[PDB]
Each structure stands twice: as structure tokens, then as C-alpha cells.
């Protein structure tokens, strides 16, 4: 029953409420492969509490796989702690969570991975974000991003 890796994400968001935050450290990235957005919304806050005593690079490596369920405020907070999030992780973030981010905040989030943002300018999260930004603000990234 529970010995299989797909077990965790076979449970509904309602059932996943009872999962104790003290378990989250043993949850491997493999276990979250089959988890929908409604389930990550329930698991992320439990990951937040389970890892909150950690900081920077050590915190990010642990929270990475759960950031799908992270709201805007937590992404803003993450940008301040000079964490260098890779573009593949950023492209899996929920659209609603990314849109309100500023040019400065996205550049701090991605660090040197911002250099690859031109190739994703038409793709799901980044496209939506670009359409809400002033072209003059996009110009400062030095990528030649278009459509503000």
C-alpha cells in the first residue's frame, strides 16, 4: 500500500492535511512527480515549517521541489536571501505567483540564470509576466526582451 513512491500523491489534498511537517525531510523529489497544484498548495506550507530553521543555499535545496505551491510573498522573501534559482525551477512556478514580481526581484531570484530568459520569452510563466512589465524596465535586464 504505502511502500510505493506514488503513494504520497495518490492521497487527496484533504487526506494530505494530516501529513506531519516532521516527515517532509524524508520526502524525496521523486515522490512529488505525480502531485497536482492543489496538492502542492497543501504540502508547501508543511515544507515551510519543517525547514524554517535553515537559511540560504541549505534552505533552497530542501524547499526547491515544493516551490510550485509557494505564493508571491514567499518568492519576494526568497529573492532577498541571494538564492540563485535555476530557470527550469522558475518555469514550473504558478503564473499567479510570478506576475506581481518586479524586474529587480526576478533578476535577484534567477541570478546568472537570467541570461537564459530570452529563449523562454514566449513560454507559459515568463510570457504572462513580460506582458505586465513596462518595456523601459525590461530594457535594463540587457536581454532584448520584447512585448511590454
Amino acid at each position, epitope marked *: 500500500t504505502a511502500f510505493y513512491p*506514488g*503513494y504520497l500523491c495518490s492521497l487527496s489534498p484533504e487526506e494530505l492535511s494530516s501529513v506531519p511537517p516532521s516527515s517532509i525531510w524524508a520526502v524525496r523529489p521523486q515522490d512529488l512527480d505525480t502531485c497536482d497544484p492543489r496538492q502542492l498548495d497543501v504540502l508547501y506550507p508543511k515544507a515551510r515549517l519543517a525547514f524554517q530553521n535553515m537559511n540560504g543555499s541549505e534552505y533552497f535545496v530542501k524547499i526547491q521541489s515544493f516551490l510550485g505551491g509557494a505564493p508571491t510573498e514567499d518568492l519576494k522573501a526568497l529573492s532577498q536571501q541571494n538564492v540563485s534559482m535555476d530557470l527550469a525551477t522558475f518555469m514550473k512556478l504558478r503564473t499567479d505567483a510570478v506576475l506581481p514580481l518586479t524586474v529587480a526581484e526576478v533578476q535577484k531570484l534567477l541570478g546568472p540564470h537570467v541570461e537564459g530568459l530570452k529563449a523562454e520569452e514566449r513560454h507559459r510563466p515568463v510570457r504572462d509576466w513580460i506582458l505586465r512589465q513596462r518595456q523601459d524596465d525590461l530594457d535594463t535586464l540587457g536581454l532584448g526582451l520584447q512585448g511590454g
Partner: single-chain antibody, 230 residues
Framework: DIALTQPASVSGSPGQSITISCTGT?????????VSWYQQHPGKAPKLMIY???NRPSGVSNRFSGSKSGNTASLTISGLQAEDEADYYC???????????FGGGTKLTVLQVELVQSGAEVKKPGESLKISCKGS????????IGWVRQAPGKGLEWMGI????????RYSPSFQGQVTISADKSISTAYLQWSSLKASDTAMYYC?????????????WGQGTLVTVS
């Protein structure tokens, strides 16, 4: 792999309602929202009609709906049209093998997102082969790639799945060690590979993009690659 049971055939007159049932176990259909439905017309790639029991992708009429009760999912088509005449496949995610599974298929009788696969292939038994599939108009690393084969006149089989991000790869039990699946992230391309072809490898091969949740939620499909071995 084929691990879910459907009836072979279902019939209805225009305007009527029909129901196709799909039966599995607590470790596929039984899992949270773990059923999707694919329509296949003659000579065309499968098309996602329903994911997550009763979610419709945009551009699919409200006439298609689905429900789930224990280990049995069902697809209802109301106000039948001639156009609905097709094969229907349920899929789920088998948590035991950690791979997608298909039903055997049901034949219904009525009384931006682009994946481009290699052209057709004509090979002899014992030769190498590498089929390719190039994605565009979406973030290639944000979605799982799946490989499906149907042998001529037979059902769909999931061969394996790959996360193009980290190249993490899982094969269905029946395709373990028979074939190699890989990704080149930089050119948005996924690959299927044989060391030494047999005659039995003659089939249509489809690449698809999507998520492993909602019983395997693959809304993007290639046109298919025909492989003839004689």
C-alpha cells in the same frame, strides 16, 4: 503498458447517451483523480478529451464528461454525433511500477504547442534506430515526455517517461531493457533508441508532453513516426 479493462465495443444512435467503463486497482484508478481519457480517430494521433476524472482541456465540448467510483472510471458522451465514432482509451498512473498505463481501448459505433517527430523509417532486423521528437512553443523542461507505441491494428502502450530537466527516466515493466529514452534539453528534443531491431518492433511511435498527475495528463502529441522492420 495495458493494465486497465474496458469493453471492446459500445454502440448508440445520434442524440443518445453512452457510457464507457474503465476498471483497474487501488494502485491506479483508485488513486486521487488518477484517470484520463484519449480519443483516437483513424490515422490520427490520440487526443486528450478528459484528465483528472472530469476536467476538459479548452476546445472539448461539455458533451464529454467523466466520473470515478472506487476502482472504476466512466466516460459519458451525451447527444452522440457521427464525429464521436472512434477508439477511446482510459489511462492511469500505476504507483507500483511508477509509469502510466492504458486500457485496452473501446470502439464506439454511431448508428502554439507543437511536437514534430522524425519521418517514417524502413529498416532490416539487427540495424540501429534513433527516432527523434522536437518540442516548440512551450518550456521543454516544465513537462514530462512520454513515448507510446501502437503495433498495427492494436491498442496504445506507454513505453516510458522522461523529465527533460534532469534526464530522469522510467520504462514500463514490458519495455525495460528493450529500448532507450533520452533528452537533449538545449535543442528541445526527446529520443527513442534500439540497439538491434526485431520484426516485432514494426509499429507507429508517438511522443507526447504533459504531467503524470490526473491519471497521466498528456495534452500535446506528435504526428507519429511509422517504423517498418523487414
Amino acid at each position: 503498458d495495458i493494465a486497465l479493462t474496458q469493453p471492446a465495443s459500445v454502440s448508440g444512435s445520434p442524440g443518445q447517451s453512452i457510457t464507457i467503463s474503465c476498471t483497474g486497482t487501488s494502485s491506479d484508478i483508485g488513486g486521487y483523480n488518477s484517470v484520463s481519457w484519449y480519443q483516437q480517430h483513424p490515422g490520427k494521433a490520440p487526443k486528450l478529451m478528459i484528465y483528472g476524472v472530469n476536467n476538459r482541456p479548452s476546445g472539448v465540448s461539455n458533451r464529454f464528461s467523466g466520473s470515478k467510483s472506487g476502482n472504476t472510471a466512466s466516460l459519458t458522451i451525451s447527444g452522440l454525433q457521427a464525429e464521436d465514432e472512434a477508439d477511446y482509451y482510459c489511462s492511469s498512473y500505476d504507483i507500483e511500477s511508477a509509469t502510466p498505463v492504458f486500457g485496452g481501448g473501446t470502439k464506439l459505433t454511431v448508428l502554439q504547442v507543437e511536437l514534430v517527430q522524425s519521418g517514417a523509417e524502413v529498416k532490416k532486423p539487427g540495424e540501429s534506430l534513433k527516432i527523434s521528437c522536437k518540442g516548440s512553443g512551450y518550456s521543454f523542461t516544465s513537462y514530462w515526455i512520454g513515448w507510446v507505441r501502437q503495433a498495427p491494428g492494436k491498442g496504445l502502450e506507454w513505453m516510458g517517461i522522461i523529465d527533460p530537466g534532469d534526464s530522469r527516466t522510467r520504462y514500463s515493466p514490458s519495455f525495460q531493457g528493450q529500448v532507450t529514452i533520452s533528452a537533449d534539453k538545449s535543442i528541445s528534443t526527446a529520443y527513442l533508441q534500439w540497439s538491434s531491431l526485431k520484426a516485432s518492433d514494426t509499429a507507429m511511435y508517438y511522443c507526447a508532453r504533459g504531467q503524470l498527475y490526473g491519471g497521466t495528463y498528456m495534452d500535446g502529441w506528435g504526428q507519429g513516426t511509422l517504423v517498418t522492420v523487414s
